[PDB]
Design a protein around this nucleic acid. Structure first.
Lengths: 77, 94, 44, 103, 60
RNA sequence: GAGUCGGCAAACAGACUUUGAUCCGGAGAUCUCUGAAUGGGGGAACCCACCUAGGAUAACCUAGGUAUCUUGUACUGAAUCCAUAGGUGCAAGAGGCGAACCAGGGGAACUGAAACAUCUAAGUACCCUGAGGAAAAGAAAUCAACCGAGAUUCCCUUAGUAGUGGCGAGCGAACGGGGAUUAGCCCUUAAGCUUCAUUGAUUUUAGCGGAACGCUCUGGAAAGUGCGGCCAUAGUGGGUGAUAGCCCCGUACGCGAAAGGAUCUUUGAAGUGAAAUCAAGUAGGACGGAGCACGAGAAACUUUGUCUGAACAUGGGGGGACCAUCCUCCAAGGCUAAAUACUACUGACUGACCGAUAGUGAACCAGUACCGUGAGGGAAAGGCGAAAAGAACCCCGGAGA
RNA sequence: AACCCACUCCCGUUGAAAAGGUAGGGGAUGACUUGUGGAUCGGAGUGAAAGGCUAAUCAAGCUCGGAGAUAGCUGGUUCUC
RNA sequence: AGUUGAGAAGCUUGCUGGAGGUAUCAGAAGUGCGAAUGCUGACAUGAGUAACGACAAUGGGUGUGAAAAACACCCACGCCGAAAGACCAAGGGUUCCUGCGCAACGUUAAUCGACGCAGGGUUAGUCGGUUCCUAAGGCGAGGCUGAAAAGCGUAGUCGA
């Protein structure tokens, strides 16, 4: 679904307050892209549907450590 | 043939005016057989339990009759009906 | 002047039969409501 | 066990046949007793051509209740209650007035 | 009863016992289908004697 | 411990039982077909198979296997060299159902406002997903005012108060008290909990013994009348031919378990708790929302969809905009019993509850009959008598009614 | 002609029938009629278009819930002095 | 039925009933019905009225019978005959046949019945299905997608 494979961010619900303060029920989607992360210690790209601050966690912790606890949770790649 | 089930196959000679007069004229004997019994089981059972030789076995499924009582509709057991045709010159005895 | 019920035992079983009810989640709870009411048939 | 059974001389307390000594024939499951000679009805039975029944007014004996009879003593010639004396493995049934066994 | 079967009769001797009193169940049902069955207690007790040879065979 | 072969269903057959049946508990055996249904299909209760072992004379049979997914493991190996994907086999586990209770995900509207849109209704109904016998929460980056109190949950108050609100309708605290319950342990590895193995103990699954009344009167029948007794850790029980402490079954009160179950308790064992090492894409901030009683309001505090982004005990957070000074705490790792919520299901006792148009829809063969294609809707129907003693025989009639 | 339709009259209207019948009438090798199986559904299908049709129901089906909606309206509210 | 009280109502009694009742004074309420086009059951009135379901059509004889317009047989007479005839699929579920029956059901009566009660009756290598194959379409390992439920679908494997 629309969940980040790194952060676990899914869609959130909320309102659409107008000028006359009418509430319309909407949904907050996360900023998901697909992206191919290069892994040196496998010599292989892994393509990963990830939110855009899930890539900030790749850039901070390394893909070799984020993939360590994607498979601890037991996901695709 | 699993040396049981020869005794579980035949449930008795069926007694009617059609069964009696067709045992006299032709050599066909009408047996009620078990309701899951193939024509090969009810042929090897008659050849075993009666030491006779069977020429042909035709079969019937019979539906049970529904009898209206008070407390609503009841029903009888659907039963099975085999016609055992023998060689001419021999009859089954019990 | 034909009427609204035109019977067919094949169309009855593929719309309302037991496999059909238990194929889908909304009909799989028809069979549990109809068993919680204690009905004799539960697939008609 | 139970207070009254078949081969017992009993006496009828508080029925139509009160004070009438007899012997138990049948003990029925709904607290009832057929006692010989007492509680005697006459059944208008329509005759059978078969081997079951034949004849008109048959006069058979009807069940009482178990509370409408007492064990007859044959020691004091009165009605008496019975109770149980539990020893080594013999449950005998004993009288209550005299505390000696019902036999 | 069972203790006449159990520990006194073997595998085959109880094995040959069923097929001998399956003929008893067979011939009593051949007599019941005609009128030639007077005593009907034989039909119910041959059912419960097959069941205890099959019981002492499952516990060998 | 003397009768029995269940009920509507009384009779009858043929029988079984003191060499101990029926019946009642504990344990085992059997347990067809469907149904998660699981070898493959399918219109549920059907159809068609495969593999291995054994037995069977041109036909089969017996006992096991054969689902998928997850995790783990062994062997195997594509593009592609390496080895990843994939393939195959083994173990172990999961699925489904259940009245409510619980933690979450998604979420109305009629209605109220005497219209209606903010708001209410209401985070209700409903759908969905998990878990447990409880769950969640929980061991202070918590409150308090310079005095102090120390986890959480629950009840009572503060109080319909402060606040909040088309300042309308409405919504609604906290501080501080009174209680219920009583434990805090760890990330240099712990309490606690699961699984077994045992140590004693207590319950539960059936039972056994269980006191004491006669005469008389009326009557169809005595328990009622009249008189006289008795018992009592048993006297306002059930029903026996009318109203019984002493007739019967019980009750008070004592006893009792081959074999299981469960709780508690000894003292070992393997586990688990357990995430690694005191917490960084974290705290904080900007936009847009949601929550806190609080309609973004001077709006603190908490959560976060997007974008950003620290300090490191001569730090950091809170104390309702904010700043200083004090006070009090250590967030970004966790685990924790009891007090609390509920009752589809058992059992015992109870009722100023009902008594057949009532009370469950349902006292009776009721979720039935019937109505609908279907989801679904949904009835009516108790009483002979103490005992069938349920009317032999006779008469009219159609071997009637 | 069958078949499918349904223009007109009368009967029928408590009907034989919750839309028929009788006598006539339109198409009848086609944009035809039809069996069997299937597909699409409730602010939603489907419609040679009438708001038609979606199980004798349709300017939003049926059923069960919110729910005893709400009703400034209607009707009714039981012994005596 | 009698009697008493301002009233709601009380008291006494004959018959029926055949096992319960509750002075008084307090306590509690599902406490008082003629109306709600109330709700359930029973029952009137309309009224022994309308009708008795196509205007193919019946008439005698005989039988059986408790009794025949209606049943059986016989002699006639009419009617259908691209069906009012023979079959198949569907759908129903024993309605088929025989013996005994007539309460109820049958728009009347019934001896008759698609009705009651009991027996019987449905025989396949070739006819239909299963098995083999596919269409529309359905499901769908994995997979792609989606708050969840789930959607779509490949291999496949169902579906005349």
């Amino acid at each position: 679904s629309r969940v980040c494979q790194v952060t676990g961010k899914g869609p959130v619900t909320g309102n659409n307050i107008s000028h006359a303060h009418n509430k319309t029920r909407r949904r907050f989607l996360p900023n998901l892209q697909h992206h191919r992360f290069w892994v040196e210690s496998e010599k292989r790209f892994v393509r990963l549907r990830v939110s855009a601050k899930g890539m900030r966690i790749i850039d901070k912790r390394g893909i070799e450590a984020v993939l360590a606890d994607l498979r601890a949770r037991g996901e695709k790649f | 043939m699993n040396q049981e089930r020869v005794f579980k196959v035949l449930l008795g000679p069926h007694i009617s005016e059609k069964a009696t007069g067709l045992a006299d004229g032709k050599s066909q004997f009408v047996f009620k057989v078990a309701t899951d019994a193939t024509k090969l089981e009810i042929k090897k059972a008659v050849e075993s339990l009666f030491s006779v030789k069977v020429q042909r076995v035709t079969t019937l499924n019979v539906k049970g009759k529904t009898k209206r009582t008070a407390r609503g509709l009841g029903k009888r057991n659907d039963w099975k009906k085999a016609y055992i045709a023998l060689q001419p010159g021999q009859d089954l005895d019990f | 002047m034909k009427r609204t019920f035109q019977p067919s035992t094949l169309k009855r079983a593929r719309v309302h039969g037991f496999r059909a009810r238990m194929a889908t989640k909304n009909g799989r709870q028809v069979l549990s409501r109809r068993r919680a009411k204690g009905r004799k048939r539960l697939t008609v | 066990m139970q207070k009254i059974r078949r081969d017992d001389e009993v006496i009828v307390i508080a029925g139509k046949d009160k004070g009438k000594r007899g012997k138990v024939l049948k003990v029925l499951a709904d607290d009832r007793l057929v006692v010989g000679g007492v509680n005697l009805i006459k059944r208008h039975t329509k005759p059978n051509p078969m081997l079951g029944q034949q004849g008109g007014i048959v006069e058979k004996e009807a069940p009482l209740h178990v509370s409408n009879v007492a064990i007859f003593n044959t020691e004091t010639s009165k009605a008496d209650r019975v109770g149980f004396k539990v020893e080594d493995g013999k449950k005998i049934r004993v009288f209550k007035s005299t505390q000696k066994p019902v036999q | 009863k069972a203790n006449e079967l159990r520990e006194e009769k073997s595998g085959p001797v109880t094995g040959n016992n069923i097929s001998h009193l399956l003929r008893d169940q067979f011939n009593l049902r051949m007599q019941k289908a005609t009128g030639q069955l007077g005593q009907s207690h034989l039909l119910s007790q041959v059912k419960r004697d097959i069941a205890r040879v099959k019981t002492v065979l499952n516990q060998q």
